[PDB]
Amino acid sequence: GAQVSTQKTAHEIHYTNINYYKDAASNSANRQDFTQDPSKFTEPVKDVMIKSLPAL
Amino acid sequence: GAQVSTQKTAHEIHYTNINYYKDAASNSANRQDFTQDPSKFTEPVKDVMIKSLPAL
Amino acid sequence: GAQVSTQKTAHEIHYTNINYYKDAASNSANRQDFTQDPSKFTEPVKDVMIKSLPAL
Amino acid sequence: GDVEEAIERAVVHVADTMRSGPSNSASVPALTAVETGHTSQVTPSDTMQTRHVKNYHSRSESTVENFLGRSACVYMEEYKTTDNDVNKKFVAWPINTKQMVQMRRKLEMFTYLRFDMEVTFVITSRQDPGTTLAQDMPVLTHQIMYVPPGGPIPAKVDDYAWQTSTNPSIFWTEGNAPARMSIPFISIGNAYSNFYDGWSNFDQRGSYGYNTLNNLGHIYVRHVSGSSPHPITSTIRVYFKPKHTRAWVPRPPRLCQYKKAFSVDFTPTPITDTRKDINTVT
Amino acid sequence: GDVEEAIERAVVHVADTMRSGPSNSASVPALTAVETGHTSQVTPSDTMQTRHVKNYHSRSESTVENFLGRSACVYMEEYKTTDNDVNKKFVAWPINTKQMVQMRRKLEMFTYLRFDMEVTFVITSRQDPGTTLAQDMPVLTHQIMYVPPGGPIPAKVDDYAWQTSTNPSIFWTEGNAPARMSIPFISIGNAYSNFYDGWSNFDQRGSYGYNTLNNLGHIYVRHVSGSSPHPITSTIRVYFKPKHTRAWVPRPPRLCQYKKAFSVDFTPTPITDTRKDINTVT
Amino acid sequence: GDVEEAIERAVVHVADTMRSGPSNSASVPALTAVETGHTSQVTPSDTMQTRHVKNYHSRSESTVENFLGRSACVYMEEYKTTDNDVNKKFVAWPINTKQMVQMRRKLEMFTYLRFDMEVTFVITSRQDPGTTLAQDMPVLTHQIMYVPPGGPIPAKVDDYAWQTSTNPSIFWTEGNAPARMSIPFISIGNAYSNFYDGWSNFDQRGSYGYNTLNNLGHIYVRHVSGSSPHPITSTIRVYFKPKHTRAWVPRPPRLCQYKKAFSVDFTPTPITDTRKDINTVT
Amino acid sequence: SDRVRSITLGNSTITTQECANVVVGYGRWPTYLRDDEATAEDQPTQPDVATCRFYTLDSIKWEKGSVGWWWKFPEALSDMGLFGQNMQYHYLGRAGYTIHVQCNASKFHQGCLLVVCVPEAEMGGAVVGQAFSATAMANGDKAYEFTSATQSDQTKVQTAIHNAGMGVGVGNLTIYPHQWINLRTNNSATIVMPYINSVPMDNMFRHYNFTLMVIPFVKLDYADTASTYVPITVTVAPMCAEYNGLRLAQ
Amino acid sequence: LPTMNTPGSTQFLTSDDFQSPCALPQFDVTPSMNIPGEVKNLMEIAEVDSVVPVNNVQDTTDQMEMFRIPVTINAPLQQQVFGLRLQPGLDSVFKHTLLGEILNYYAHWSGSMKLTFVFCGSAMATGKFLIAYSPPGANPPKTRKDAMLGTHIIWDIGLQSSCVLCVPWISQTHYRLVQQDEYTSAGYVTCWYQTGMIVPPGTPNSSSIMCFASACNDFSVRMLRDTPFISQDNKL
Amino acid sequence: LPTMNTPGSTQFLTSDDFQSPCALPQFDVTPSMNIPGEVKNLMEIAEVDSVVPVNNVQDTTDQMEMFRIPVTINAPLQQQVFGLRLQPGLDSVFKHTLLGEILNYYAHWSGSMKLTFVFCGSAMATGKFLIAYSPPGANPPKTRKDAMLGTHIIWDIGLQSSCVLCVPWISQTHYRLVQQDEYTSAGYVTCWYQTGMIVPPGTPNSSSIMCFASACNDFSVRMLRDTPFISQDNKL
Amino acid sequence: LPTMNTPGSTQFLTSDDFQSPCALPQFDVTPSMNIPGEVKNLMEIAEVDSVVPVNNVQD
Ligand SMILES: CN1CCN(Cc2ccc(NCc3ccc(F)c(F)c3)cc2)CC1
C-alpha cells in the first residue's frame, strides 16, 4: 500500500511513501498543500464592491 | 504480502505493515480494536428490566 | 512507484530506484544523460559551409 | 496478493444525545431499585430537556490493550566487575512482577491475564570512587542468561554454566541500543493468575497465596570478561510490556500501601480524607 | 492495490499580468475609500500600460505548515551526575512554549493553533574542572520521563517514581542519534490558545492570562545509575516541531521585548527609528 | 503501477570510421579558411586511406554533471571548547566558493551555473598539549546553524540566538557518520554568476566584481555544552557537491595563481615553459 | 443610493443616512450552535427578541486632547436588560454581536477615528511583575482612557497609546476587523462580529470575548464655532444568543 | 542499498510499537479457554456503581460511618442534608470511589455522571427530598430557594427506594482536567428537605441514606498518566 | 539483508521530514471545530493594509505624530510633501509595518506593492497632489519636473477620499534581497503639490494625510530566515 | 525487521550518489530561463580551436 506523488521542482519526478506506524500523528509533514484564499481578510464587506465602479 | 489499514486521526491516511518473523508473538501490538460491551457487569440480572417501567 | 532502468557496463543489468523525500532537490544525481551537440561552438556561422566545397 | 487491505475497524464513537421535550406521563425512568444489583441505564435525556448533540469522542485510549501497553521497570540491581565477594559480581533474580509498586498495582486490577511479553534491558556503568582512577579500559560487554525452572544455576562469574547450549542468552555491548526480546505466553495454566486463595499441600498446609504459582525461572547477568584494575559498578533495569492482552474478572484497586513482595499483608487505612462538616464545600 | 498514485496538487502559480493599453473612460479603479475597511484589489495593469508576463513564482514556502515546520529550542537545563544538593542532580520542567523568545514570537502571530508535535532531545556531557581528573567511566545513560498532570513527582534521583509503569519514558545512551518521539493533539479544548483574556475564578479573581490554561504536565530527566568519583555535568536541549498545523485569527507581531515567561508585561517602545527629516532619502 | 520502467538512454557511442580509398578530384576537404571563425570538421578518412572501425568508446565521464559531481573541501576552521577569548570558541563563515583553489578553478570554467547542492560536514577533535592531561570527558556534541542574510548573529557561545526557531540547524555527536543535507537552488537570479563585470552603485562607484552578488548568508558552529577542565580543539571541514547541474558560456581556464579570495587580481605569468630551440624534440 | 443603511433587531431600529458598508467579521455571519459541534447535554434556552436588541452603552466626549478609549465585552453589557439577567443565571453562554459607533460633525470639522474589535485582547500591567485587580480593565459600561505618556501607577494597566497596551505596534491593528470614521465622508461604523473562541461555549463573567477600541489617529480640529466637543455613542446588539446550565443567580 | 539514519535512532521509547525477535522459537502456547467475565475496556468498570463516603465529618471514630447520611424526624422547614464539590478525580469524596480510581490514571475526562440515592429507613417512614446540581458560579447556594433554580429533581420515597439524578455535561470545553482548578470548575451538588420525614409510633427516630456514583454511556477519558495514590521508598 | 550506511546517518537536521513512533498510542483527539478566520498562508496577512509611520522627523515628542503627514494652505507653487526609499524590509519607514514584519522572516521577495493615501482634512478643503515612483538611478529627484518623468499618478481630492498608487515590479532579477544593497536597489517614492490646498473661511489652516502599505496578488517570498528584531540575553 | 550492516556503513565516499533530506522544505525555485550557449559536455569545449605556442626558444 504505497503512495506515489510528484515532487517540487520551473517547467523542466516521483517519490514513494509508506506509513509504518498505526497512529496518524506519526506521519510526515503534509507540506504539499498550496490552496489559499485571502478574501476573508481583504474583502470582509457585506455588499460586494466592483473595483471599476466608484466605492461610494 | 503487505497489509494496508487506516490510522487514527475528528472528521478531517493509510499505513503499510509487514511481518518479518515466523512467530506470532513477535508482531506489534494490535491496539486498533475498539469493540466493547458493558452489559455483563451493569445488567447481570436474569429478567430484563425496561428503564421506563417500574423496577418492581 | 519504483523506476527500473539499465546500468552502465562494451557489448557484454537493471537497478531499482525509489524516492523517499517530498522535495525534488533530495533526489540522487541524474548522471545518465549523454546527449550533446558541439555545433554551437564549432559552426557558429550564418551560412552553412560544406567541407568538400572551398571555404571561399 | 501484493496488498491484503485490512478492512477498517470503523471508529466506535460514544452514544449521541437525542432531543427531548416536556413530558407528563406514568413512566418514571428516574425511579429504580438498586436492590436488584442492576445499575440504572438512565441518560440525561430522560430527566430534563436536551438538545441534539453529535459526539465524536471515542474510548480508544481506555482499552486494556492500551492501558497495559506501556513498558515499566520491574527490577533493578547492581553488580561489580571485580570484587572480593564472589556473590557480588553477578545477579540472580527470580522472575516475578510483585517487586515494583506501580506495575504491580496496575496488573492487580484483574484476576486473570493472558498476554505476550516484550522485555527490554537498560544497562549503565560507572567507575567507583577511589584514590587512584587513572586507567584505560576498552568497551565492556555483558551477558544475560535465562534459566527455566530446574536448570543448572551458576555459582560464580566464571562457572561452566555460562556456556549456554539450550538456555537463551543475549550478549550486549555498551554504546548501542538497549537489548530486546519477545516472550510468548508461557503459563502451564490457561492464564496467569495474580491471586491464588489456596495452599500448596492437599491437607491445607504449606505455602499460601500467589507465591505458590510463581515458577517462571531465573535471570543471570555478568560481565563477559571485563576485570578492571579498579572496580567498576554496573546497573541493569528490566522493563516489561504486555502485548495482545486479555483480562478477566476485574477487582477493586488496592488502597493500602504494599509491604511484602510475596504476600497481601497490609495495615488498616482510613477510607479517605476528612473535611470540616457534611455541608462544607469551600 | 500495490500503488495508490496520489493525484498532483497542481502547482498554484501567482497571478499573471495581462497586456493593457491606453484608456480614457469614466471608470476610476485608482480611486477608492478605505473607510469601508476593504483593501483595494487594484493591479499595476489598471494604472499604466503593461506587457504580458507569465509568472512561474509560487507561494509554497509561505504556507503556515512550512512557516512553523522547523524545530526550535524551547528549553535547556543542566544537571550533575553526583553532588551534595539532591535537587541539583535532576531536572523538573513544567511544559510551556513561552521560555525561549524566537519560538514564542513565531507562535504568537496566531490566536489559536492545532497541530501534532515532534519532540527531539539533544544531550551532551562534560567533566567538571578540578584538581584530580584521572578516571575511567563507561558510557553514560539517561532517562526522560513525562508526567501528565496529577501524577506522582519524584523527589530524588533514586526515588521509586522512576519505575514508570504508565508514564512514557525514554532510555538513551550517549554516542547514538538524538532521541525522538511524536505527540498528538492533547488539548482539552478544540485548539491551543496562545492568549486568554480572562480570570480563573468565576468572580473575576485569581490568576490572569494564558497562565491559567497551561496544564500540560512536567518532564523529568536523570542519569540512570551513573555516579562518578568526580562530578560530571550534562545539558539537555528540547526541540519542538509542529506538524499538520492549522491556525486561526492572525494578530500583529509583537514589538516590545519580552520580560516575563508567564505574562504579557512590557515597557513602552518607540514605533520605529528616526531620520533627519521627512524629505531625507539618502 | 508497481514498476515505471524508465526507457534506456541508449548509450551514445562516438562516431565510427568509414573505409576510404584513393581519390583524385576537385574537392579539397583539407583546405579551409579559419578567418570565418569556423572550426574545420574534417576527419582522418578525408586525407588518407582508412579501414572500417567500430568505436565503442563513450563520452559519459566528460559530462558536466559528472565533471562537477564530486565533493570538495571549500572551508576549514578551528574552534576551542574553552578559552579566554570569546571569539575563539565558535566559527562564523560567510558562505562563498572562492576560498579553496581547486574547486574555485573548476567552477570558474563556466560563466553561469544552476544546480542543487549537497553539503557534508566532517568534524574532528583533539586534546591540546599541556602539563596535565588526565581527565575523563563524555562524547562531545556540536551544533551547525545556518543564518540567511539579515538574521540575528550570535556574539558568544551561550547567546540566545542559538535557540533556532526558524533557522535550520543540525545537532551531531562524535563517533557517528558525517552530517549531511540537501540545499535547493537559492539564487535570486535565474543562475549563479561566477563573474560580474559591474559596480554596486548606479553611478559606477563602490564595490566592484563578483563580491557584489555574494549574499548567501553565514554558518555558525559551536560545542553544545562541552566545557572541559582542559582545552579541546575541534576542526570542521565543509564539502560541496553540485547536483542536477546546468552550465552556460564556457570560458578559458585560469592560468595565473590566485591571490585574493574576493577579486581577480593576479601577477603576469609566462605563457608556458621553454625549450632549447624550435627543432629540439628530445 | 448605498449611503443609507437600516438595521432592525428585536423591537429596536437603527437608521444611518450617511455611512459606509458593513464589515462582517472574518466573512462569517452569526449562527446558532450545530448539533454535531455541541458538548453540553441539556436543552439550551433561546430567548430571541428579549435579548437580541440594541442597547446604547453610555456616551463619551471627544476633545482636542483625547487619546482613545476601550470597552470589554460581554462584561460591558453585564447589567443591561434581560441580557444581563440571563448571563447571571446561566453557567454557559454564546452570542455574536453587532457594533454600531456613531459620531457626527459639520462639514468644517476634521478628524479620523479607528474602530476595531480585538479578540482575546490580553493586557499587561503598568509595572512588570505586578498583578492588578479586575477593576482597572473592566467596570461595567464605563469607558476606559488611554494615556499619551507611559503609565506609572502600579494598580492599573499600561495605557501607552502607541503600544495599545498589548506590546504591539498600534498601526498594525488593521489586521483585525475594523472601520474608519472619517468626518469628511462618514458618520458611523458597523461591524458584525461572530462568536470566536476555542470552545463551543464559555462563561461570560470569567472570559472577555473581545475588546472594542476607538483611537483618534488624526486629532479633532475646528475653528470659530460654538461647538466645543463631538459626542461619541456606542450601540451593541447580541445576535443568536443562547444560554445553558441554569443555576442560582451569581 | 544506501541509507541514512534519521534522528531518533537507537532511542528507547516506552510507548513504541515495533517487532522484535522471539527468544523461544516455535513455542506451543496453551489452548485458550473462555473464562467468564472478560473485560475489554476500563469504561465497562467505570460504569458500575460504588458507594460514596459522603459523611467525612473529621470526627468519624468508626470508619463505616462515612457511608451513612443522617436524617432526623424533626428538622426546620428548609434544611440542608449534604453538599459537595463535583471534582470526581480530586475531591476527597470521590477520590477513592470505583469511578475515581479509574480517572486518576488519566488526565482528561468528559461526559455525564449518575448519582443514585437509596433510602434505608423503615417501611413506614416517608418523606420528600430535593436534589439539585448547580453549574459553576461565583458562590455556592446557601438556601433551598437558591438551589431550586438550577437543575434538580424532587424525590418521593415509596415502594421504589432508589432515585437517580443525572448530572448533565455542561462545560465550555470538550474536556476537563482531572486535576481540576478554577478555570475548569464543575459546580456543586446539594440535597435539601422538601417536606420532611414523618414516622408513626414505635419506629426509630433516625434513618440513613447512601449514595452511588457511576458514569453514563457517553463518558470517556484521555492522556494516560501514573496515579499519585501509591508510592514506595525502598525495594520490597 | 545486507545494507550500508551512507553519509548523513545519525545526524539531526532541524528541517527534516521523517516518521517517528508515537508516545501515546491510540490517543483520541478532540473533535475539530471550524473556528472563523482560518489562515492558510502568510501572504493572506501580507495583503492587508497597515498604517506607515512616514513622519520620522527625529523630533517626535508624541509618538502618534509619526502617522500624520502635514499639509498647509499656503506653500510655494512646487514643493515636496515627503520622500522615502523603497526598501520594505530594511528602511525604518517600512521596517515595522504589517508587511515589513512578514518579509523580515524571509531573505528574498518579489512582486508589486500598493501605496494608498487618504486625505483626512475638512470636507470643504480641496487640492491636487502628484505621487511619483522613480526607478533606481544615480540620483533621486529634486524637483517636480524631475519626478514627473517617472511613473506617477495625479491625485484629485473629492468625494472619494482615497487614492492608490501601484508600484510596478521593475527589476533586472526575478527576486530582490530583503537586506537590500546598491546592487538590488528599488528606487524612490515622492509626493509633490500639484495645485495646492485651498480652504474657505472658518476652517483649520492645516491638514494631515495617512499612507497604507500592502502587497499585490503577485507578491511572494523565499528562503526562511530568523528575524533580527527580537533578542534576549538571559533565560526568562 | 532483522537487518545486518555490511562493511562500508557510515563511511563518507566523495563520489557517492545517495538521497538526503532537504534543509529548506517546499522551497520555490526561480523559473528557468534559456540563456544562450548551454554546454553539456567538456568535449564540446575540447573541439574548439586554440593557438599553440610553438616558438618556445628559451630566449
Ligand atoms: C503468578 N503470575 C506470574 C506471572 N506474573 C506476570 C508475569 C509473567 C511473565 C513475566 N516474565 C516472563 C519472562 C519474559 C522474558 C524472559 F526472558 C523471562 F525469563 C521471563 C513477568 C510477569 C503474574 C503473576
Ligand SMILES: CN1CCN(Cc2ccc(NCc3ccc(F)c(F)c3)cc2)CC1
Ligand atoms: C497554552 N498553550 C499551551 C501549549 N502551547 C503550545 C505547546 C503545546 C504542547 C507542547 N508540548 C506537548 C508535549 C509533547 C511531548 C511531550 F513529551 C510532552 F510532555 C508534552 C508544547 C507547546 C501553546 C499555549
Ligand SMILES: CN1CCN(Cc2ccc(NCc3ccc(F)c(F)c3)cc2)CC1
Ligand atoms: C556568486 N555566486 C555565489 C554562489 N557560488 C556557488 C555556491 C552557491 C551556493 C553555495 N552554498 C549554498 C548553501 C548550501 C547549504 C547551506 F547550509 C548554506 F548555508 C548555503 C556555495 C557555492 C557561485 C558564485
